[PDB]
Design a protein around this ligand. Sequence first.
Ligand code: MG
Ligand code: MG
Ligand code: MG
Ligand code: MG
Ligand code: MG
Ligand code: MG
Ligand code: MG
Ligand code: MG
Ligand code: MG
Ligand code: MG
Ligand code: MG
Ligand code: MG
Ligand code: MG
Ligand code: MG
Ligand code: MG
Ligand code: MG
Ligand code: MG
Ligand code: MG
Ligand code: MG
Ligand code: MG
Ligand code: MG
Ligand code: MG
Ligand code: MG
Ligand code: MG
Ligand code: MG
Ligand code: MG
Ligand code: MG
Ligand code: MG
Ligand code: MG
Ligand code: MG
Ligand code: MG
Ligand code: MG
Ligand code: MG
Ligand code: MG
Ligand code: MG
Ligand code: MG
Ligand code: MG
Ligand code: MG
Ligand code: MG
Ligand code: MG
Ligand code: MG
Ligand code: MG
Ligand code: MG
Ligand code: MG
Ligand code: MG
Ligand code: MG
Ligand code: MG
Lengths: 56, 120, 122, 209, 114
Amino acid sequence: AVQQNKPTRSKRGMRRSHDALTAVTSLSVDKTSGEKHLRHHITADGYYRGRKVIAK
Amino acid sequence: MRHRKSGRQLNRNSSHRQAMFRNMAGSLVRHEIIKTTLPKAKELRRVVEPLITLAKTDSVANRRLAFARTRDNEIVAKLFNELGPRFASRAGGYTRILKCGFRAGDNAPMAYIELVDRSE
Amino acid sequence: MIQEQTMLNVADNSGARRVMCIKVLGGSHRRYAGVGDIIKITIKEAIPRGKVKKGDVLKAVVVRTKKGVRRPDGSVIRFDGNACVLLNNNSEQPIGTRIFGPVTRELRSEKFMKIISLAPEV
Amino acid sequence: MIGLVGKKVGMTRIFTEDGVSIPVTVIEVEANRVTQVKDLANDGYRAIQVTTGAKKANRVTKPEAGHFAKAGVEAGRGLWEFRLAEGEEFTVGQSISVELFADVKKVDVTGTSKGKGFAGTVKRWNFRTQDATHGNSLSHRVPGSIGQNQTPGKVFKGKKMAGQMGNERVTVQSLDVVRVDAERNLLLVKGAVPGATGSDLIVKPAVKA
Amino acid sequence: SNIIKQLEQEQMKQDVPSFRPGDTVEVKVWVVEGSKKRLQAFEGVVIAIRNRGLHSAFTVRKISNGEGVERVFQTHSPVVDSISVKRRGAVRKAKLYYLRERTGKAARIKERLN
RNA sequence: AGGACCGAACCGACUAAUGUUGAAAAAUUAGCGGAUGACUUGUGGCUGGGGGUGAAAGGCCAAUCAAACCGGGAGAUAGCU
RNA sequence: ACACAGGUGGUCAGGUAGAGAAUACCAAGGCGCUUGAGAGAACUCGGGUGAAGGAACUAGGCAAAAUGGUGCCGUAACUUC
RNA sequence: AAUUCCUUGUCGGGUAAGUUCCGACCUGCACGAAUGGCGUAAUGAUGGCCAGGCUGUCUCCACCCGAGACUCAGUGAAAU
RNA sequence: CGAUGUCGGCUCAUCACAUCCUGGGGCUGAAGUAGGUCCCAAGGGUAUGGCUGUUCGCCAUUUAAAGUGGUACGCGAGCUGGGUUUAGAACGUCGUGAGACAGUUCGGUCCCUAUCUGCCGUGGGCGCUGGAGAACUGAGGGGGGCUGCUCCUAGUACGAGAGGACCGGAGUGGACGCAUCACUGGUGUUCGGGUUGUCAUGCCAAUGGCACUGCCCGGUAGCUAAAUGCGGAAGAGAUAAGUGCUGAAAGCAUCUAAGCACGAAACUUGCCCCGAGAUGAGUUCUCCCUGACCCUUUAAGGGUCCUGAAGGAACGUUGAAGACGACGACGUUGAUAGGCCGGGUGUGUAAGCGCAGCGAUGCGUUGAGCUAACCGGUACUAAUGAACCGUGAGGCUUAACCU
Ligand SMILES: [Mg+2]
Ligand SMILES: [Mg+2]
Ligand SMILES: [Mg+2]
Ligand SMILES: [Mg+2]
Ligand SMILES: [Mg+2]
Ligand SMILES: [Mg+2]
Ligand SMILES: [Mg+2]
Ligand SMILES: [Mg+2]
Ligand SMILES: [Mg+2]
Ligand SMILES: [Mg+2]
Ligand SMILES: [Mg+2]
Ligand SMILES: [Mg+2]
Ligand SMILES: [Mg+2]
Ligand SMILES: [Mg+2]
Ligand SMILES: [Mg+2]
Ligand SMILES: [Mg+2]
Ligand SMILES: [Mg+2]
Ligand SMILES: [Mg+2]
Ligand SMILES: [Mg+2]
Ligand SMILES: [Mg+2]
Ligand SMILES: [Mg+2]
Ligand SMILES: [Mg+2]
Ligand SMILES: [Mg+2]
Ligand SMILES: [Mg+2]
Ligand SMILES: [Mg+2]
Ligand SMILES: [Mg+2]
Ligand SMILES: [Mg+2]
Ligand SMILES: [Mg+2]
Ligand SMILES: [Mg+2]
Ligand SMILES: [Mg+2]
Ligand SMILES: [Mg+2]
Ligand SMILES: [Mg+2]
Ligand SMILES: [Mg+2]
Ligand SMILES: [Mg+2]
Ligand SMILES: [Mg+2]
Ligand SMILES: [Mg+2]
Ligand SMILES: [Mg+2]
Ligand SMILES: [Mg+2]
Ligand SMILES: [Mg+2]
Ligand SMILES: [Mg+2]
Ligand SMILES: [Mg+2]
Ligand SMILES: [Mg+2]
Ligand SMILES: [Mg+2]
Ligand SMILES: [Mg+2]
Ligand SMILES: [Mg+2]
Ligand SMILES: [Mg+2]
Ligand SMILES: [Mg+2]
């Protein structure tokens, strides 16, 4: 269950082929402040869908 | 499988879920908005709404069934006096789920579950 | 579900008290026995001066199963207690004369005509 | 004859006057509207391309919206295709309803099965389990051996192992039709058909009965 | 489930005598003997009632000559005819399965009468 | 009264499973035996390498025992690898 | 070897039920075990329940399942009584 | 027979069927009288066997509840 | 010999044909039934138990038959450890003894997270030549292929009797596989109820926590079987062993040499599933894009500004979908999920109060109260308008029709 021959850098890279990260890259500007954020997520201060939903 | 088995396990005991959703429903009523993960938010929504559904009609019998659940009179007093009247005409969603971000520690998608009509 | 090693009761006037099914006759790898299937049993307990004796091997037919038999309407005639009727090994010919314990209409198939005729109920 | 696409809506029983409870399955069949008449002289084989059901204006896409508007029909929830068995001419936009089934008496259903997950070898292939006791450690529901030894050296192609059971196309054959409803647009077939409630059924007459 | 429930209605018979479980029922079923529809009888205590609309069923326990017979009956079927009640009983449980072990003078019930 | 009986502490370790690059270089969970004695245990001593001690297995003598460990003879010797 | 499911002598040791320091639930006091959050496949481990049958399992009733307390009645072969 | 190679000896009992088990015969390969012989009440985490009970051991598994498994964030090995 | 782990059992098999059964035939000391023997045939099927650690074997009871072998006498990086070759002990025998025994007996650690190949499932990238969205053809491949009994034909044929068919056609079972919860049941630690111990809610009352869900009794959905449906085939083509026609070589005879016709569960199809990465990358239908300027070793080149379509992806609410991706539905032009309402199902006559009673408790209000993922409705809450990717009529040579 161990290993038989040592794999290569080639095999180490082809395995990490699909380990590659992926960004969001397409954000939304709010109607009120326009501060970019994630779709369906509040802003840093509490704005969401053009509304202060944090109420604070 | 779990075909049509609506209920979320939350990696806990069944005896833990009855007491976690009892104390978390309690701090949602004492406060008005709390912060937790979505899988707790989508589920607390299933427990706190049947309380606002309940407290629309006051009676000695409804106080007991609202005291078996939530196990504290202060929440029972907050119910039937505040929320029942404050959500009377509306027939439906008495709370709102609202996604915010993540935790630094374990990277859990969080959300602010909030009771509606908090523009006082 | 009467299968091998099942301790049945006896439901005729022959002498035995407890029999035990040792083979469900009828087919290869045949698991259990049902309504009116012929089975091979052995006698584990009898009355003293009776016809059959302990340690004998003869055939039988199941009559009353604890699991019960389904009628074509989705109804079941679930009894309470497994029981059978002893037969001759060499022919149909039941050795009993007084079939006790009410049996099912599902045995009416012309080779068990003597069984229903001597039966008390159903 | 050809066939017809219907929706599986539950199953119940329809009693006979002899008391024989007949387990039927209700197949909701509105009307298969025919979109295209494929031809031997155009494609290389004769077949009709039907559809049924209702769509949404914002949901029917541009490529298919022309494809429905070529013949001209209310757009259905996807297309299907039935091969003609003899010289059976039709027209485009034709509505083939359930009345074709007022004559045939042995039918055939074909639908996606009920998805059962990543099913182990015990559930999927009916492997007898090993002993729950008498020493048995960590192999209570294991498939055991999966090959001989050095002579093959490999596992043969097609070994029964653990994988995907269900959510696959299944044909249950020779169901006896019970009642053919005209107004209620139903079809009562004796027994059970694949897939959960609401799953599609490609209902055809029995071909080898 | 509209098209099934509307189809469920067409088979169900509109005169079924409702009752609480524990009642000593007397039911009559059509048994066919060759070519003669004989009209049987069957008594016993109702053990359980499974209400499912058309798919209804109720279990009746009869202490016969033998050990004991239990029969279930698809309520809305053309076999069953009588749902005549003899003794209205008073039990607390909804399904009486403990009467498979109590016997004789231990397995007797109380008439309801209230 | 009892090398008496059932049964905790305490001691011991028969069965099974888990674990066996373990939580642990022998333990854990569910059971189990003794449990006022030929008992168990604390502290402090005594007996030592062909010797000690042993209700006796050639077991134990610092995770090591048909002859402990450390240093020296010693870079023993090896027709073997 | 470690912030290790192990080992470590003596003393004090409440309430209710109970024969009891067994055991259950609590007091005082002290802690939630130094990775968590979702999903709810196969499979593995710790467990629950089960139609009919009931050892047919297997090296073997291994493991489970079952019996389980007090009062009273009653209690064989054999025996060193 | 903790002993019998031949051998699962032969006869009897238990079972539908018994290389084991119990009783007995005696051709004791190769029992035998303090390296004790033959019995023996009680005792035993003892060896073999049988019956009642009881049950997922099994016929044949099915479902459910938790801990891993699977995914994400952090840390991050090993034999080879 | 700087390791190739061993019998048997469990599990999972797979191939061979010297075939146990079923199928097709010749011969017979083949009347019939039932057998013997030989040839063709591997599609499928090919016992449960008592005794032994045993394979084998004996025995009991069946079955259509309970085939013979290869496959490290298949399978310990899958399991067991009974047997046997570690350390303990005893008996018989051998030896002065330590010990020894193809004699025996009781007891006795079975390690490993899979890199590669292989196999079972599932996706990403790119290609398929403008791109995209759907529906199919179809090379190749896989799955499936078993069979008894009763009845009719007919108790006819055959037979002195006794007995007792072929063929053909219906019905009912076993084994196995696929599928499904409408029926019958199982589980149902998210539902209801009962009750023991104890703590708490200030106390009675009424509840909650804990003790494996405390122990229990039932039970929705879902899952699933013991439950319920269905399946093998018919038929066709070409054949094996075999049976014939015409018929010469050889005036005859003869199935074979020319030619022709029948002939098996085997072969190819018919049934079902996968399937255009079949790089030989197919076909049909539909939709969308028909903007301007420079450089240049001027070529299927590179660059910029203006537009970036169909569609896809991402995100979100989730599914009878699912390990993760993926796949399906929906995204206010709204029914996808939660909630709410009506209904249903289940449990069972709640709480409070009144009356009867010393009391436990009962009766009445009341088949009420509570009701999990169930069914049908309803936007009350959440699916924010945009943005991101993908483009701008699609090369070369040639032929055939339009001009
Ligand atoms: Mg990776
Ligand atoms: Mg976790
Ligand atoms: Mg608990
Ligand atoms: Mg182990
Ligand atoms: Mg103890
Ligand atoms: Mg020295
Ligand atoms: Mg020297
Ligand atoms: Mg620590
Ligand atoms: Mg420690
Ligand atoms: Mg105490
Ligand atoms: Mg405290
Ligand atoms: Mg789980
Ligand atoms: Mg259990
Ligand atoms: Mg035990
Ligand atoms: Mg136990
Ligand atoms: Mg004998
Ligand atoms: Mg001698
Ligand atoms: Mg001696
Ligand atoms: Mg001597
Ligand atoms: Mg002695
Ligand atoms: Mg003795
Ligand atoms: Mg002892
Ligand atoms: Mg036995
Ligand atoms: Mg990670
Ligand atoms: Mg013949
Ligand atoms: Mg066996
Ligand atoms: Mg055998
Ligand atoms: Mg092996
Ligand atoms: Mg062990
Ligand atoms: Mg093909
Ligand atoms: Mg093929
Ligand atoms: Mg004649
Ligand atoms: Mg005949
Ligand atoms: Mg049920
Ligand atoms: Mg239950
Ligand atoms: Mg409860
Ligand atoms: Mg109280
Ligand atoms: Mg507490
Ligand atoms: Mg208990
Ligand atoms: Mg139940
Ligand atoms: Mg090309
Ligand atoms: Mg899209
Ligand atoms: Mg609407
Ligand atoms: Mg909804
Ligand atoms: Mg009352
Ligand atoms: Mg209550
Ligand atoms: Mg409700």
